[PDB]
Design a protein around this ligand. Structure first.
Ligand SMILES: *[C@H]1OC[C@@H](O[C@@H]2OC[C@@H](O)[C@H](O)[C@H]2O)[C@H](O)[C@H]1F
Length: 185
Protein backbone atom coordinates (compact mmCIF):
# COMPACT_ATOMS: atom_id res chain seq x y z
CA UNK A 1 0.00 0.00 0.00
CA UNK A 2 0.95 3.63 -0.37
CA UNK A 3 1.77 5.68 2.69
CA UNK A 4 0.09 9.07 3.04
CA UNK A 5 1.63 10.29 6.26
CA UNK A 6 5.06 11.74 7.05
CA UNK A 7 6.02 11.87 10.72
CA UNK A 8 8.85 14.19 11.73
CA UNK A 9 8.89 15.38 15.32
CA UNK A 10 11.78 16.43 17.48
CA UNK A 11 11.83 18.06 20.91
CA UNK A 12 14.51 20.37 19.51
CA UNK A 13 17.60 18.61 20.81
CA UNK A 14 20.71 17.87 18.79
CA UNK A 15 20.75 17.14 15.08
CA UNK A 16 18.00 15.24 13.28
CA UNK A 17 18.42 15.00 9.50
CA UNK A 18 15.14 13.45 8.37
CA UNK A 19 14.72 12.78 4.67
CA UNK A 20 11.30 12.34 3.11
CA UNK A 21 12.19 9.85 0.39
CA UNK A 22 10.36 8.47 -2.62
CA UNK A 23 7.29 6.35 -2.03
CA UNK A 24 7.41 4.83 1.42
CA UNK A 25 11.14 5.31 1.84
CA UNK A 26 12.75 7.58 4.42
CA UNK A 27 16.08 7.99 6.14
CA UNK A 28 17.36 9.54 9.33
CA UNK A 29 20.74 10.75 10.49
CA UNK A 30 20.80 11.87 14.12
CA UNK A 31 23.37 12.86 16.71
CA UNK A 32 23.29 14.00 20.35
CA UNK A 33 19.54 14.44 20.28
CA UNK A 34 16.79 14.68 22.85
CA UNK A 35 13.67 12.73 21.88
CA UNK A 36 12.55 12.44 18.26
CA UNK A 37 10.19 10.33 16.15
CA UNK A 38 10.48 10.00 12.38
CA UNK A 39 8.63 7.72 10.01
CA UNK A 40 6.14 7.02 7.26
CA UNK A 41 2.70 5.53 7.43
CA UNK A 42 -0.96 6.45 7.42
CA UNK A 43 -2.86 9.50 8.63
CA UNK A 44 -5.48 7.26 10.21
CA UNK A 45 -4.40 4.13 11.99
CA UNK A 46 -6.31 0.89 11.79
CA UNK A 47 -6.44 -2.14 14.11
CA UNK A 48 -6.72 -4.41 11.02
CA UNK A 49 -3.77 -2.96 9.13
CA UNK A 50 -0.83 -5.15 8.09
CA UNK A 51 2.41 -3.19 7.94
CA UNK A 52 5.27 -4.10 5.68
CA UNK A 53 8.75 -2.69 5.90
CA UNK A 54 12.36 -3.16 5.01
CA UNK A 55 15.07 -1.44 7.01
CA UNK A 56 17.99 -1.28 4.61
CA UNK A 57 19.91 0.54 7.32
CA UNK A 58 19.57 0.17 11.06
CA UNK A 59 22.61 1.55 12.85
CA UNK A 60 21.77 3.13 16.17
CA UNK A 61 24.70 4.29 18.33
CA UNK A 62 22.86 4.31 21.62
CA UNK A 63 19.17 4.38 22.54
CA UNK A 64 17.00 3.96 19.47
CA UNK A 65 13.91 1.98 18.47
CA UNK A 66 12.77 0.55 15.15
CA UNK A 67 9.08 0.25 15.84
CA UNK A 68 5.51 0.54 14.71
CA UNK A 69 4.24 3.71 16.31
CA UNK A 70 0.88 5.38 16.69
CA UNK A 71 -1.69 7.12 18.85
CA UNK A 72 -5.36 7.02 19.74
CA UNK A 73 -7.64 9.43 21.53
CA UNK A 74 -10.48 8.72 23.98
CA UNK A 75 -8.41 7.69 25.71
CA UNK A 76 -5.04 9.17 24.79
CA UNK A 77 -2.64 6.30 24.21
CA UNK A 78 0.79 6.03 22.60
CA UNK A 79 1.47 2.49 21.35
CA UNK A 80 4.47 0.57 20.09
CA UNK A 81 5.48 -2.64 18.38
CA UNK A 82 9.26 -2.74 18.72
CA UNK A 83 11.09 -5.09 16.35
CA UNK A 84 14.60 -3.83 17.07
CA UNK A 85 16.49 -1.43 19.31
CA UNK A 86 19.89 0.01 20.08
CA UNK A 87 21.62 -0.30 23.44
CA UNK A 88 18.42 -0.23 25.51
CA UNK A 89 15.58 -2.73 25.27
CA UNK A 90 12.34 -1.00 26.33
CA UNK A 91 10.43 -2.62 29.20
CA UNK A 92 7.73 -1.83 31.75
CA UNK A 93 4.96 -3.67 33.59
CA UNK A 94 4.95 -7.20 32.13
CA UNK A 95 1.47 -8.31 31.05
CA UNK A 96 2.24 -11.40 28.99
CA UNK A 97 3.44 -12.37 25.51
CA UNK A 98 2.17 -12.64 21.91
CA UNK A 99 3.51 -14.63 18.98
CA UNK A 100 3.28 -12.85 15.68
CA UNK A 101 5.05 -12.82 12.35
CA UNK A 102 7.64 -15.39 13.40
CA UNK A 103 8.68 -13.72 16.63
CA UNK A 104 7.69 -13.60 20.26
CA UNK A 105 6.89 -10.29 21.88
CA UNK A 106 6.58 -9.30 25.50
CA UNK A 107 3.64 -7.08 26.39
CA UNK A 108 4.23 -4.08 28.65
CA UNK A 109 2.43 -1.04 29.91
CA UNK A 110 4.00 2.17 31.11
CA UNK A 111 2.88 5.67 31.96
CA UNK A 112 4.18 9.07 31.00
CA UNK A 113 3.79 12.00 33.36
CA UNK A 114 3.82 15.62 32.20
CA UNK A 115 5.15 14.61 28.77
CA UNK A 116 4.43 16.03 25.32
CA UNK A 117 1.67 14.36 23.30
CA UNK A 118 -0.06 14.62 19.94
CA UNK A 119 -2.45 17.14 21.51
CA UNK A 120 0.46 19.48 22.13
CA UNK A 121 1.60 20.88 25.46
CA UNK A 122 2.12 18.27 28.20
CA UNK A 123 -0.01 15.67 29.92
CA UNK A 124 -0.16 12.22 31.52
CA UNK A 125 -0.88 9.20 29.32
CA UNK A 126 -0.49 5.45 29.07
CA UNK A 127 1.81 3.64 26.67
CA UNK A 128 1.15 0.16 25.25
CA UNK A 129 4.11 -1.94 24.21
CA UNK A 130 4.91 -5.04 22.27
CA UNK A 131 8.63 -5.69 22.39
CA UNK A 132 10.32 -8.52 20.56
CA UNK A 133 12.23 -10.85 22.89
CA UNK A 134 15.20 -10.74 20.51
CA UNK A 135 16.06 -8.18 17.82
CA UNK A 136 14.48 -8.87 14.46
CA UNK A 137 17.11 -9.08 11.70
CA UNK A 138 16.93 -6.13 9.30
CA UNK A 139 17.52 -5.77 5.57
CA UNK A 140 14.70 -8.20 4.80
CA UNK A 141 11.03 -7.72 3.92
CA UNK A 142 9.35 -7.78 7.34
CA UNK A 143 5.67 -7.90 8.23
CA UNK A 144 3.81 -6.69 11.30
CA UNK A 145 0.32 -8.11 11.64
CA UNK A 146 -1.06 -5.42 13.95
CA UNK A 147 -4.34 -7.30 14.43
CA UNK A 148 -2.45 -9.94 16.48
CA UNK A 149 -1.07 -7.33 18.86
CA UNK A 150 -4.36 -5.46 19.24
CA UNK A 151 -6.14 -8.69 20.11
CA UNK A 152 -3.40 -9.73 22.55
CA UNK A 153 -3.51 -6.36 24.30
CA UNK A 154 -7.29 -6.59 24.61
CA UNK A 155 -7.13 -9.91 26.48
CA UNK A 156 -4.86 -8.18 29.03
CA UNK A 157 -7.21 -5.26 29.54
CA UNK A 158 -5.24 -3.00 27.20
CA UNK A 159 -7.93 -1.30 25.09
CA UNK A 160 -7.10 1.39 22.56
CA UNK A 161 -9.02 4.63 22.07
CA UNK A 162 -11.99 5.09 19.72
CA UNK A 163 -10.40 8.02 17.84
CA UNK A 164 -7.47 6.79 15.75
CA UNK A 165 -4.58 9.11 14.93
CA UNK A 166 -1.56 8.48 12.69
CA UNK A 167 0.16 5.10 12.44
CA UNK A 168 3.71 4.78 11.11
CA UNK A 169 6.78 2.56 10.99
CA UNK A 170 9.23 4.80 12.73
CA UNK A 171 12.63 5.43 14.11
CA UNK A 172 12.71 6.93 17.59
CA UNK A 173 15.91 8.08 19.25
CA UNK A 174 16.63 9.38 22.73
CA UNK A 175 19.86 11.15 23.70
CA UNK A 176 21.83 9.19 21.10
CA UNK A 177 23.18 9.12 17.56
CA UNK A 178 22.79 6.84 14.58
CA UNK A 179 21.41 6.15 11.14
CA UNK A 180 18.43 4.40 9.65
CA UNK A 181 16.89 3.83 6.26
CA UNK A 182 13.45 2.33 6.09
CA UNK A 183 10.88 1.59 3.39
CA UNK A 184 7.24 1.19 4.42
CA UNK A 185 4.31 -0.20 2.46
C1 LIG B 1 6.32 8.91 22.70
O1 LIG B 1 7.11 9.39 21.59
C2 LIG B 1 7.55 10.78 21.56
C3 LIG B 1 6.47 11.75 22.11
O2 LIG B 1 5.42 11.86 21.17
C4 LIG B 1 5.34 13.07 20.41
O3 LIG B 1 4.61 14.04 21.18
C5 LIG B 1 4.46 15.31 20.49
C6 LIG B 1 3.69 15.10 19.17
O4 LIG B 1 3.56 16.34 18.49
C7 LIG B 1 4.47 14.10 18.30
O5 LIG B 1 3.75 13.86 17.09
C8 LIG B 1 4.63 12.79 19.08
O6 LIG B 1 5.38 11.87 18.31
C9 LIG B 1 5.88 11.29 23.46
O7 LIG B 1 6.19 12.25 24.47
C10 LIG B 1 6.41 9.91 23.88
F1 LIG B 1 5.69 9.42 25.01
Amino acid sequence: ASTDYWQNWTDGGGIVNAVNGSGGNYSVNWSNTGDFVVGKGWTTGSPFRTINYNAGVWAPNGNGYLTLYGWTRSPLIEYYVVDSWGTYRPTGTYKGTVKSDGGTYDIYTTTRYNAPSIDGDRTTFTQYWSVRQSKRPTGSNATITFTNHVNAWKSHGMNLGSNWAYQVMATEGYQSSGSSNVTVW
